[PDB]
Design a protein around this motif. Sequence first.
Motif, short mmCIF file in Angstrom:
data_model
loop_
_atom_site.label_atom_id
_atom_site.label_comp_id
_atom_site.label_asym_id
_atom_site.label_seq_id
_atom_site.Cartn_x
_atom_site.Cartn_y
_atom_site.Cartn_z
N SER A 109 42.75 64.12 -42.16
CA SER A 109 44.13 63.82 -42.51
C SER A 109 45.07 65.01 -42.34
O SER A 109 46.29 64.82 -42.32
N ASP A 163 46.61 56.40 -41.03
CA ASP A 163 45.61 56.92 -41.95
C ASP A 163 45.02 55.78 -42.76
O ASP A 163 45.69 54.78 -43.04
N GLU A 164 43.75 55.94 -43.14
CA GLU A 164 42.98 54.87 -43.78
C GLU A 164 43.02 53.60 -42.94
O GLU A 164 43.38 52.52 -43.42
MG LIG Z 1 42.49 61.45 -45.81
#
Ligand SMILES: [Mg+2]
Lengths: 86, 201
Positions: free
Chosen positions: B48, B105-106
């Motif tokens: 991330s 993200d995710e």
């Molecule tokens: Mg992350």
Amino acid sequence: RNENFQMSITPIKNLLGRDAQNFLLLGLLNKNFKGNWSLEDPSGSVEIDISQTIPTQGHYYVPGCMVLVEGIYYSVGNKFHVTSMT
Amino acid sequence: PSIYGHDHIKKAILLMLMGGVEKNLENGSHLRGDINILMVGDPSTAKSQLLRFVLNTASLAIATTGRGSSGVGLTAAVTTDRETGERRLEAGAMVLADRGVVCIDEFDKMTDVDRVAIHEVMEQQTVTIAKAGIHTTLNARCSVIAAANPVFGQYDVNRDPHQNIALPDSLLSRFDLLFVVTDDINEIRDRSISEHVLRTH
Ligand SMILES: [Mg+2]
Ligand SMILES: Nc1ncnc2c1ncn2[C@@H]1O[C@H](COP(=O)(O)OP(=O)(O)OP(=O)(O)O)[C@@H](O)[C@H]1O
């Protein structure tokens, strides 16, 4: 505070990731609870190999006293192979 | 420069920054020139912190999170113009990043109904809107970099790769480079990385 020293003495736990180089260790010489010769400082402890040690003649090396030692640390096990003792 | 290692992923990101040459072909077709990268790995592996860097260094970048996004929020939404009175369209995340990059993200935590829309954008690079009397095709030419986690907490080498990743095969085929990254315990690596982190702080 000695004049000659300014290699410097390194704490033992600073040897936990190194695979080479030289170190000057100062600490108690004793025997571990397993029966192996070892060196101990307030930071930690390490096993010691005497198989190829050349001591400085002129004094006594009895367990329970401070010793200046020099050698190389091997991370395959946990051993400080000694090459000099004073 | 604040990330230790991951040299190949950093090369792939640079190759993303300088995209390929798009070829317009007969039958109204185009070969895409964008490079799409997926990163699957273990927790706390600096996945991330590279998306955030791409957000800053790139000219155009749009950030997205899997669970806090919707299909109508990625493609387009029907709204009204108060000043004049007509009904119009408002751009979403994908179409706002034309000739840009989208960092998701995710990605595995996204709902299925949400995941179909991104499929079309990844395939045709166009959005089709046929709602409320507004029939339009919208251009969306964006590069996708994504980060996800395996089905379990950590990657398992004793199981087949498809079992580890919950994503379908059709979605997985649309990524140029899939990077599986794993954190392995080794004393020298720990001694170096801890020194680097403590120097940074
Ligand atoms: Mg992350
Ligand atoms: N190689 C590395 N170099 C520097 N810092 C790192 C590295 N790996 C992890 N970190 C640190 O770990 C912390 C968490 O990293 P990050 O948030 O990027 O992980 P992640 O892969 O997104 O994790 P998650 O699976 O939990 O979402 C940050 O403080 C980051 O600086």
